[PDB]
Each structure stands twice: as C-alpha cells, then as structure tokens.
Short mmCIF file of C-alpha atoms and ligand atoms in Angstrom, two decimals:
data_model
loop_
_atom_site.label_atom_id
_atom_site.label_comp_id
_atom_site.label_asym_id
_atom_site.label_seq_id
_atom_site.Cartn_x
_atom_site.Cartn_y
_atom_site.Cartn_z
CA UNK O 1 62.17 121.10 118.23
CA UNK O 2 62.90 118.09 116.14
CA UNK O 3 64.64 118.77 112.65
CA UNK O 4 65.36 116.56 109.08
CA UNK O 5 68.35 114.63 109.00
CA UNK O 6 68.95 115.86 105.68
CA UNK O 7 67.61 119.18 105.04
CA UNK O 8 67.72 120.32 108.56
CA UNK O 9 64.51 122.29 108.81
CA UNK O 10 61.99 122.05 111.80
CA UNK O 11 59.68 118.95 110.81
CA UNK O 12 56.57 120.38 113.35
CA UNK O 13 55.56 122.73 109.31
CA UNK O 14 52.76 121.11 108.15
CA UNK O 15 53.82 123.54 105.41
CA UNK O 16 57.05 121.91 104.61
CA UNK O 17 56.22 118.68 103.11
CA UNK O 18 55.90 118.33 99.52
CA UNK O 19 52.83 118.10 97.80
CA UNK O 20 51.86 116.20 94.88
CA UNK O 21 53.61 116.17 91.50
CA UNK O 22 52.46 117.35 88.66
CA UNK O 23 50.25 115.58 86.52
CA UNK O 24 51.76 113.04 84.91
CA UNK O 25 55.10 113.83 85.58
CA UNK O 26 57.87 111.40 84.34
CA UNK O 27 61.79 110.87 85.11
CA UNK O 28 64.37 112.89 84.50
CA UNK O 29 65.81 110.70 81.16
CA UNK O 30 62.08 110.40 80.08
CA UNK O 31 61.45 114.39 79.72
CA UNK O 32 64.28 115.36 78.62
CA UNK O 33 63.78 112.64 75.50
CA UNK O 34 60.36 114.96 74.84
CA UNK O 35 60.10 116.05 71.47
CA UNK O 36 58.83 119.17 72.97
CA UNK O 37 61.97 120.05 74.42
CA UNK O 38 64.30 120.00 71.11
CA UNK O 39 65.29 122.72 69.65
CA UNK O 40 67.18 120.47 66.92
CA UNK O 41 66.67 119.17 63.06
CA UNK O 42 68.40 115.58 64.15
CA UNK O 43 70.92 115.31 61.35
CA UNK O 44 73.86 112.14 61.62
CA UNK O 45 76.33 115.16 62.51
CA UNK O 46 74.97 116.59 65.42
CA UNK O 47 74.93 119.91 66.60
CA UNK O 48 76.23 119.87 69.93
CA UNK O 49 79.16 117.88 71.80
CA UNK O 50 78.42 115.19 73.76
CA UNK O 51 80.09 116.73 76.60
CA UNK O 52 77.58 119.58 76.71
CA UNK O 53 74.50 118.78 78.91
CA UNK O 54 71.39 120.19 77.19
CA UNK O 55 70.07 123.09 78.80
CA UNK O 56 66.01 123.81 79.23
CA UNK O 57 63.74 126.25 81.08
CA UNK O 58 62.02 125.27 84.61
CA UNK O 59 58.51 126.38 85.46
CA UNK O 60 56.38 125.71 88.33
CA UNK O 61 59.29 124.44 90.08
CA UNK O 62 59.60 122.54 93.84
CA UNK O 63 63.21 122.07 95.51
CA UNK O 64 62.68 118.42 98.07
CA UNK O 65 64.50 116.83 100.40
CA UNK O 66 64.58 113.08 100.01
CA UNK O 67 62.39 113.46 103.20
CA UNK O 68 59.76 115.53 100.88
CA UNK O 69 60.23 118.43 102.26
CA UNK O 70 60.51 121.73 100.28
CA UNK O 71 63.62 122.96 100.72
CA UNK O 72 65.91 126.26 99.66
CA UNK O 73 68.75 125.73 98.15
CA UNK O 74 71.20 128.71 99.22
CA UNK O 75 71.74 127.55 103.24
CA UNK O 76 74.57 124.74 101.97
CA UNK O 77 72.69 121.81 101.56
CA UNK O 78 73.86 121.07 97.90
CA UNK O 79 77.61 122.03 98.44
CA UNK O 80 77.35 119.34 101.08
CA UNK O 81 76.15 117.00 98.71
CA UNK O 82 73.40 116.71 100.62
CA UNK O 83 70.52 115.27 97.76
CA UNK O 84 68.13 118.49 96.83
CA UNK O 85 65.44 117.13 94.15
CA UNK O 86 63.02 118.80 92.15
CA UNK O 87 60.21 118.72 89.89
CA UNK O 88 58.31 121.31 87.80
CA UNK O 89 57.70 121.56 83.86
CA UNK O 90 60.44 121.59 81.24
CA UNK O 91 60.28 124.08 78.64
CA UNK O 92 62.19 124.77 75.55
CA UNK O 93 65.37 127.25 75.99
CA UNK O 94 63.86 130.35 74.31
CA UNK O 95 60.48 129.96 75.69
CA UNK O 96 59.13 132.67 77.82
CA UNK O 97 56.36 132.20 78.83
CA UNK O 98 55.94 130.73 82.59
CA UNK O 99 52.86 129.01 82.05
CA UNK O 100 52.97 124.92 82.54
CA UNK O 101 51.27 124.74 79.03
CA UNK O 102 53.55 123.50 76.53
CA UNK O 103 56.06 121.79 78.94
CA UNK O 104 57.02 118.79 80.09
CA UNK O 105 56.07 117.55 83.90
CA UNK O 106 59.41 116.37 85.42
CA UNK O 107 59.18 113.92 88.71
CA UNK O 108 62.32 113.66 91.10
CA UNK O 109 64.71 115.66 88.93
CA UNK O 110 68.19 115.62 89.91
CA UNK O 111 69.85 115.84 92.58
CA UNK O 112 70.84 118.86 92.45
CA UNK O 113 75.05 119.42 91.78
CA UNK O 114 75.18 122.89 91.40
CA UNK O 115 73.10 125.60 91.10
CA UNK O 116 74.26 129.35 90.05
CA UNK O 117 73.16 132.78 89.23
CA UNK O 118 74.08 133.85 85.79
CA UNK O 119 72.21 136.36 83.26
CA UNK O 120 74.65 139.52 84.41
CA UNK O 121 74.01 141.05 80.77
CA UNK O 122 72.32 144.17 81.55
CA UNK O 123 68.84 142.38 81.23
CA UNK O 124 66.00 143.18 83.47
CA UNK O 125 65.94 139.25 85.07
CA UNK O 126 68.65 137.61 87.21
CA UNK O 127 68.97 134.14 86.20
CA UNK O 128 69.28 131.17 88.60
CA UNK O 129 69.82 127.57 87.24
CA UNK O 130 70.52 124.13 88.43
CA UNK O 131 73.07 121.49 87.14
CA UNK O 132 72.10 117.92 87.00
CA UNK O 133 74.03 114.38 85.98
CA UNK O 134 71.75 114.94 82.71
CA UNK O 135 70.64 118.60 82.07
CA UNK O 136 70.76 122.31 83.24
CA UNK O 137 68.07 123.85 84.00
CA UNK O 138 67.03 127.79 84.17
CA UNK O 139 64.41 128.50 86.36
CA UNK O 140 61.09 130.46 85.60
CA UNK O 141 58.61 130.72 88.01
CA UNK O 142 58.26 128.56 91.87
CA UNK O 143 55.13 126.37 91.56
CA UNK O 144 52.71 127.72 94.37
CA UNK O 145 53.94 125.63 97.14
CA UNK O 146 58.04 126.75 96.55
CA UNK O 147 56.90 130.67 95.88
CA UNK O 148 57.95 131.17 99.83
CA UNK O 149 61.06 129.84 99.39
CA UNK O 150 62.00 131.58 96.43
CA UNK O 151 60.90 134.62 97.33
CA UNK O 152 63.32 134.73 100.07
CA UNK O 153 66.64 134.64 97.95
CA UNK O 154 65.84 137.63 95.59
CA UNK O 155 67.24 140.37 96.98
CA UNK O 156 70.34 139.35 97.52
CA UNK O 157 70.61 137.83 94.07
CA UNK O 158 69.29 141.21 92.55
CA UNK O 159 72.11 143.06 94.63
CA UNK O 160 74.63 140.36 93.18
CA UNK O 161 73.39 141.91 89.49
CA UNK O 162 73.92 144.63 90.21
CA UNK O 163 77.32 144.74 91.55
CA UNK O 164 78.83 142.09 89.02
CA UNK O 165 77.35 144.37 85.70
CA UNK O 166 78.82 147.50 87.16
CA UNK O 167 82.25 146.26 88.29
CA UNK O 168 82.02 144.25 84.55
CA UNK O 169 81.89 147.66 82.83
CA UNK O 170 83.33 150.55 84.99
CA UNK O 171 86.57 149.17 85.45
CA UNK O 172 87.98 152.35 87.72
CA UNK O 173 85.12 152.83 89.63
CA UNK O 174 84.90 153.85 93.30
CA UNK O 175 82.82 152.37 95.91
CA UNK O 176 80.72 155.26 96.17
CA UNK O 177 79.87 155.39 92.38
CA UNK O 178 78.94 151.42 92.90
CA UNK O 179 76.11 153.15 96.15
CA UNK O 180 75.08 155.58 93.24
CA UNK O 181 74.29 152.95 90.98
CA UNK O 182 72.49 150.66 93.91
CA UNK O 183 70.60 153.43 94.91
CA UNK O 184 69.39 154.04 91.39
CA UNK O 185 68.44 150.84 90.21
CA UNK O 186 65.24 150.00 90.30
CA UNK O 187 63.93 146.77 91.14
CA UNK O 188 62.66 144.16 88.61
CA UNK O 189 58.94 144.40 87.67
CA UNK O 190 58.13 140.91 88.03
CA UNK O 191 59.07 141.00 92.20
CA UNK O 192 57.76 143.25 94.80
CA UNK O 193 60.89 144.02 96.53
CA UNK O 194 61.91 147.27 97.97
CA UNK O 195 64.93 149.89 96.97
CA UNK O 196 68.04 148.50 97.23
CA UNK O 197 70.24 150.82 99.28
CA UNK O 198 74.38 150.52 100.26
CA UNK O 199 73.16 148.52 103.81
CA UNK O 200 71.26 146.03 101.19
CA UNK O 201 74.98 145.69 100.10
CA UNK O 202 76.75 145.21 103.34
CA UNK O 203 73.96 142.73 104.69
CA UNK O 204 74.88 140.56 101.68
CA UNK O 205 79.08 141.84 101.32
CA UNK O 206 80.10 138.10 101.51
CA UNK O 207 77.37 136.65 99.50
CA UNK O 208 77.74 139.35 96.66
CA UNK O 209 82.07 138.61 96.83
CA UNK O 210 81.51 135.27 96.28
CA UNK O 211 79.02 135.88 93.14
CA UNK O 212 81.95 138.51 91.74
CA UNK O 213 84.48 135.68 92.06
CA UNK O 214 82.21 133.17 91.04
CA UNK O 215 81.55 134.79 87.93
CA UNK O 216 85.42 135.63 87.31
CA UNK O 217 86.37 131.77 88.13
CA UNK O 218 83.60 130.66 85.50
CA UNK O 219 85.46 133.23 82.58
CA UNK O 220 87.67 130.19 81.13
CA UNK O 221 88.13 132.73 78.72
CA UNK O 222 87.93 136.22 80.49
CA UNK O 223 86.01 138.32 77.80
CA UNK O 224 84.85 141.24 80.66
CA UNK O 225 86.75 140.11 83.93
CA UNK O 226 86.31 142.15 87.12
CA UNK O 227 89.56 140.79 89.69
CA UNK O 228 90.44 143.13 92.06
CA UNK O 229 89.34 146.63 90.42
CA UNK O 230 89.41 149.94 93.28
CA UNK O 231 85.78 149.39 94.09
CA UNK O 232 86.32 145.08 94.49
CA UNK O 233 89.45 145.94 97.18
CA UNK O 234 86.73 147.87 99.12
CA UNK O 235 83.80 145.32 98.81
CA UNK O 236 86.67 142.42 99.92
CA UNK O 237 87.61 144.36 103.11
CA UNK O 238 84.20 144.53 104.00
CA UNK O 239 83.13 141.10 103.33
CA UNK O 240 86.06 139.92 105.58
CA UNK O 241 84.45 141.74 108.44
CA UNK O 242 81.28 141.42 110.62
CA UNK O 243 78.59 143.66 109.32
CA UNK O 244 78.73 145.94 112.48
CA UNK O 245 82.06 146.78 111.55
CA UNK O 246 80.73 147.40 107.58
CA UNK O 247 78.45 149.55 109.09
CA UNK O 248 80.65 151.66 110.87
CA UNK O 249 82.43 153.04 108.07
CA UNK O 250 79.44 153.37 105.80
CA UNK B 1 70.66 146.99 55.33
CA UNK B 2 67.84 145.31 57.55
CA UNK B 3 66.81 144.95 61.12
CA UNK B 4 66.54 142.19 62.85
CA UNK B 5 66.22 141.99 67.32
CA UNK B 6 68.02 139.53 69.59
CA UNK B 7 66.46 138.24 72.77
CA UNK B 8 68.77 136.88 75.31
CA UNK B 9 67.24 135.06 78.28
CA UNK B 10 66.98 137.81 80.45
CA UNK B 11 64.78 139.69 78.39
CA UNK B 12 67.45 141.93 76.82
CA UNK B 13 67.06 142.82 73.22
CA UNK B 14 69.52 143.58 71.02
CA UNK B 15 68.86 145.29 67.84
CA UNK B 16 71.27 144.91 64.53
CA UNK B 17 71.44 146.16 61.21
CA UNK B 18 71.67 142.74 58.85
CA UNK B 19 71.34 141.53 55.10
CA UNK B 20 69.75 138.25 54.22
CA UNK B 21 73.33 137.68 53.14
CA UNK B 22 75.12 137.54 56.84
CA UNK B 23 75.91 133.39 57.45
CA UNK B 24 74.76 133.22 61.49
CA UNK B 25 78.54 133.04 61.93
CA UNK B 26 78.57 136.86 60.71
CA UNK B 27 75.74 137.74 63.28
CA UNK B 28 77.11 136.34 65.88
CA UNK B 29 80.53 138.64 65.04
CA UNK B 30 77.62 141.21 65.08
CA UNK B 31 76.70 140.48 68.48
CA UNK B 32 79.95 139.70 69.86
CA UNK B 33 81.18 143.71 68.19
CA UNK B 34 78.37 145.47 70.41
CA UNK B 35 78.11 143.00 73.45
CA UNK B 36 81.06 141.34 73.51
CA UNK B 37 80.16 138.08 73.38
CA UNK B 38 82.24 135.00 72.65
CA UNK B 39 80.49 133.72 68.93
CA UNK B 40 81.85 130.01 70.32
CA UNK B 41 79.19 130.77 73.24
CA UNK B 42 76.31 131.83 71.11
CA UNK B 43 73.48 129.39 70.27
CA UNK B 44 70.73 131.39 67.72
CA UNK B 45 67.72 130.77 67.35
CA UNK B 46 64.29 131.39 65.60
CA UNK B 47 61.13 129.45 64.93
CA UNK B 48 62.34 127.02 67.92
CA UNK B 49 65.41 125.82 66.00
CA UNK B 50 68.85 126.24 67.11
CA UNK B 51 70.79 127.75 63.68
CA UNK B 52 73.93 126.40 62.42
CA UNK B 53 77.06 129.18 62.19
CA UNK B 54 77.72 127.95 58.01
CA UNK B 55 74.53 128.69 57.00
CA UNK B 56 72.79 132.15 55.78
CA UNK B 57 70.36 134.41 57.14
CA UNK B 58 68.14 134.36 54.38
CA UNK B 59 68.31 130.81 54.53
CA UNK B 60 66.28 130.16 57.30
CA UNK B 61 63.20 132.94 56.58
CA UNK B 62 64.13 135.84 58.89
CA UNK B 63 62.08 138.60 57.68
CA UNK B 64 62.49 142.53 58.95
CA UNK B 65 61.71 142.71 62.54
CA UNK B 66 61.67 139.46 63.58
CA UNK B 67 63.23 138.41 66.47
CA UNK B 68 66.23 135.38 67.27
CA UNK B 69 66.97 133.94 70.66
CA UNK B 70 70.42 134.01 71.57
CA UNK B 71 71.44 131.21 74.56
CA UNK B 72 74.93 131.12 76.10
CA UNK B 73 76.46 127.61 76.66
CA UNK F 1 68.32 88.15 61.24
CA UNK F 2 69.66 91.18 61.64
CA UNK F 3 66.92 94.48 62.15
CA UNK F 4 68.20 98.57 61.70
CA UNK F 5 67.44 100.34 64.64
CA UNK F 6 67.94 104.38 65.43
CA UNK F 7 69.62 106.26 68.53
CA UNK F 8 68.37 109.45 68.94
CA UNK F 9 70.77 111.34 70.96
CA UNK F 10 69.88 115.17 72.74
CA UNK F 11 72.35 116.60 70.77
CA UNK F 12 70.37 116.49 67.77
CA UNK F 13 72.48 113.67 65.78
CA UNK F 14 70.73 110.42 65.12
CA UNK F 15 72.66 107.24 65.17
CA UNK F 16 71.27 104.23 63.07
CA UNK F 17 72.32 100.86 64.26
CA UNK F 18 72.22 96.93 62.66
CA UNK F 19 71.05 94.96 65.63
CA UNK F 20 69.50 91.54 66.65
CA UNK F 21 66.26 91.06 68.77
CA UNK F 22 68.74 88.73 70.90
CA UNK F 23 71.14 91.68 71.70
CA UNK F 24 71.49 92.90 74.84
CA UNK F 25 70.86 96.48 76.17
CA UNK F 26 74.26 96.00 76.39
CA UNK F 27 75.24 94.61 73.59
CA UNK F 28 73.63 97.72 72.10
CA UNK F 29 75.94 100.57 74.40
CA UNK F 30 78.67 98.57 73.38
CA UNK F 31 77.82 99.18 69.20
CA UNK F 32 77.34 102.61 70.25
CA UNK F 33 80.64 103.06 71.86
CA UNK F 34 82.77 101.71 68.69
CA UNK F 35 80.70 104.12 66.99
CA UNK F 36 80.31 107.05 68.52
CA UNK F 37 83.07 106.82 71.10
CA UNK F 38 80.30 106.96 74.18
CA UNK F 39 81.56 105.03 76.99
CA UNK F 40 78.66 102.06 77.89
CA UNK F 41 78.57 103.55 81.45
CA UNK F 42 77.40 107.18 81.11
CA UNK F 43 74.75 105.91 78.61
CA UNK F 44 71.36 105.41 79.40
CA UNK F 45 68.68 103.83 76.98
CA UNK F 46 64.98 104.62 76.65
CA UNK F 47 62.33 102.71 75.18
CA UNK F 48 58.31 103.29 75.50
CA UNK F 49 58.81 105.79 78.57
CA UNK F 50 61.29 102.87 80.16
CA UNK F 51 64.83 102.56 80.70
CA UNK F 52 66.29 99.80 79.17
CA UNK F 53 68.28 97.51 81.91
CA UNK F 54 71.43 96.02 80.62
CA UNK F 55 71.14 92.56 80.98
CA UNK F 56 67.77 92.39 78.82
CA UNK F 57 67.66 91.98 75.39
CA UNK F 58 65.69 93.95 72.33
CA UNK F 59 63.46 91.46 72.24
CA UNK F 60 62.20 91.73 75.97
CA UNK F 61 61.59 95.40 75.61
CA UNK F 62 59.62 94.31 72.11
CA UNK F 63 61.68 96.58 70.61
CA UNK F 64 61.22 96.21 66.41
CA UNK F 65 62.65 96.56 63.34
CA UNK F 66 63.12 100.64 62.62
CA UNK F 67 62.25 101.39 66.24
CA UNK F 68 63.67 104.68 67.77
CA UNK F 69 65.86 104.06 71.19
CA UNK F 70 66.78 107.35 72.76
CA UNK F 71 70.33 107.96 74.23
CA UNK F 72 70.82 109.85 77.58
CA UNK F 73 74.05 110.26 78.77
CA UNK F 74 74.89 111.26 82.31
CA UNK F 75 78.78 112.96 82.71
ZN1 ZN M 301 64.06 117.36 105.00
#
C-alpha cells in the first residue's frame, strides 16, 4: 500500500489525481491583475497598504499535491510546509454567488501558507480561507472533484463556530450552558450535516481549543477576547485528555 | 433618519438607521456601536467599489434599503 | 527618447513612470523603488498575460509608449 511522498495518501485512488483545470485558467499574478477582481477607482493615492495582500472569493476550488493529487488541507501537510496548490475561479470580495460565471480561472495557485477559519460573527456560514505569497483567498464552493474532501472538515469547523461565538459573548458561562447552546443550534442550510450534540464537542475538544486560541492569538487588538473564561478551563482539561476519558465525565 | 443593511461575508445583515449626511467613517462608528467592530478593520462597500472613510453617504448614491458589503482586513 | 509608462498596483493606486524602450525590467523595479519605496525583490511585473524577466528590456516585451505594466508584489 504505496503512498505520495508529499501528500501521503494511498496512490492505488484512481480518484485522487487531479483533473483538468479550468478553462483557460492563468497564474496566480495574471488573475489577480483581472479587472474583474478590483473593487478599486485606481487613484495615485491608493487605497490600501502595500503590506496588505488583497483578499478575493474562491469558487469551484481543488487543493493538489505537486504530485496532482487532491488533497485536504487539515491532516498537517501545510504546517509542514509541505506545497498544497490550488486552482478554482476568483471572484470579487462581496460577491456571493458560487457560480464560476463572472470569475477568474486560477491555475497552480499558491502554495498554500496558511489557511484559517474565520467568519465567527454570528452569521449563518463558517468561513475558511487560504493565505498565499500574493493574495488571500475565502473559499465558496469545492469544484466537483474536491466536494469529498471538503465535505469531510465541516463539522468540526461548524462546532468551532459555535464554541468561539458563545465563549466571545457569554463571558461567565458554564460548560453546560455551552451543551445547551450546541444542542440548539441548528446546522447551516447549505450542508447536510446532522445535530451537533456535546460528544460532537469532545470528538473535536483539541481541534475546537486550538480554533479558541487561534482566534484570541489573531486579536492584535482584543476587541471580544475569550482567554481562559469558566467554560474555556473546562474545554482545556478535556482537550488535554484522550476522548475516553472526556467521555467519562460527560 | 434612513435605513440602510450591511452584509458581512457570512451572510449576516446588519440593519442601521443613517442620513445621506453620515461620511462612511460615521457608519462604520455605526457598526462598530452595535457589533463591535474595529472601524480600522472595516472595508464598505456598494456597487462593487470599496468606499473611502472621508467621504459621504450621499456621495456615493445609497438610496433607502440598499445594501453595503462590509469585509474585515 | 524617453516614453511615460503606468504601474498599476492591486491596491488601487496607479504609478506613472518616464522610461526608455532600452530599460530593463529591472531598471524599471528599481524607478519604482525610489518611488514608491517597493523593494525590486518582492515585485513582480506583468505585461500581455507574461511576467516580465529582469534582465529583458521594454523593448523585448514590445512594451509602448502609455502602456499599462501591472505590479504584483509577493511579502
Ligand atoms: Zn500526493
């Protein structure tokens, strides 16, 4: 059972390699230069600094080893700096509509430095973007091919939501108030995923710490920090133990 | 007093009472009062163009109802 | 001799530029350093769907007079 060098996956998937790009699909630089994708009047001022990387939607996307085959991009791969690319169509920042029309097809994107979940305002989506050397990028919908893999990672980034925008706003809040809330949310209406209950929680304790510190570490400027609230104490003692042991005290 | 709705990228809409007089600097401080956001983090926008924090509401066309698109940096 | 040129950046500022067909690409990051305070080496140029290689000049790329360049940068 022979696996990539790079990406690590079983290479006997005739499902796994990468198809074709999309039509016409150009270099990073290239796209991003599309008139399509600026939201600016160009005036000699500017409106943004030059240490800001300009920030677009993602639709249709594919994540690719440098082996061509799809890959996902939560097992480590990218931390390791191991080279994730992609390719989709670039959209304009407010756009919202998923459909390829009116973007821009983008060939061997990245690699990929960073991705991250963000979007923890109360809004119905979770957000997931990637960093490049050029752009960011917020992701819309998986082309076809990537659906799969995408699919996989929603639930515990939906959990993740909903644990970082209730320890954001209910600052003395007890575990079991946090199950309450879990229990009552219901899941987005774009996925097909099923109630989230508290083992949803402890199945993904460490994954769901790390997105609570994550999102604390990114405040520069903490404008609704979480730390180590009542109900963040309890979800740090779990995620430091195996989830038989989370289990037993549930 | 007018209203005017605020889509961030989530889908989240936020509704505020505004007069073609606010600068975009104003409805940020608008935005930041109810949701707490940062105005040095808020990038506005309608008709596709980002809006500059000097310049008016009326400025730019808004009429009642329509809706801007707020993006965090 | 010399030919205006424009630097369109994707920060929505447009940089205009006195250049000559015999400049190099690099020639042309270096102008747009003293100007703009862009180090050469996180710049990239496009021309036509290409990116412009530093040791050829404007006039290899058949770039003209009033012809729009487009700065990338990667940091
Ligand atoms: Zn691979």
């Amino acid at each position: 059972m022979p696996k990539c060098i790079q990406c690590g996956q079983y290479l006997d998937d005739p499902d796994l390699k990468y198809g074709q790009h999309p039509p016409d699909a150009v270099d990073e630089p290239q796209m991003l230069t599309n008139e399509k994708l600026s939201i600016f009047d160009a005036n000699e001022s500017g409106f943004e600094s030059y240490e800001a990387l300009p920030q677009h939607k993602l639709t249709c996307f594919s994540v690719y080893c440098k082996h061509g085959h799809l890959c996902p991009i939560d097992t480590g791969l990218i931390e390791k700096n191991i080279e994730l690319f992609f390719s989709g169509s670039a959209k304009p920042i407010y756009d919202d509509d998923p459909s390829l029309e009116g973007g821009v097809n983008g060939k061997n994107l990245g690699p990929i430095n960073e991705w991250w979940i963000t979007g923890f305002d109360g809004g119905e989506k979770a957000l997931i973007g990637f960093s490049t050397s050029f752009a960011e990028y917020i992701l819309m919908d998986p082309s076809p091919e990537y659906a799969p893999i995408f699919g996989l990672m929603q639930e515990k980034i939906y959990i993740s939501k909903i644990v970082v925008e209730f320890l954001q706003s209910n600052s003395d809040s007890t575990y079991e108030d946090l199950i309450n809330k879990i229990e009552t949310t219901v899941p987005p209406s774009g996925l097909n995923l099923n109630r989230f209950t508290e083992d949803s929680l402890l199945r993904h304790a460490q994954f769901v710490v790390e997105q609570v510190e994550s999102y604390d570490e990114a405040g520069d400027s903490d404008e609704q920090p979480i730390f180590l609230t009542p109900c963040m104490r309890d979800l740090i003692k779990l995620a430091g133990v195996t989830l038989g042991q989370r289990r037993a005290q549930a | 007093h007018m209203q005017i709705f605020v889509k961030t990228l989530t889908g989240k809409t936020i509704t505020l009472e505004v007069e073609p007089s606010d600068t975009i600097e104003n409805v940020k401080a608008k935005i930041q009062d109810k949701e707490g956001i940062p105005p040095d983090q808020q990038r506005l926008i309608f008709a596709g163009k980002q809006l500059e924090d000097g310049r008016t509401l009326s400025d730019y066309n808004i009429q009642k109802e329509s809706t801007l698109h707020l993006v965090l940096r």
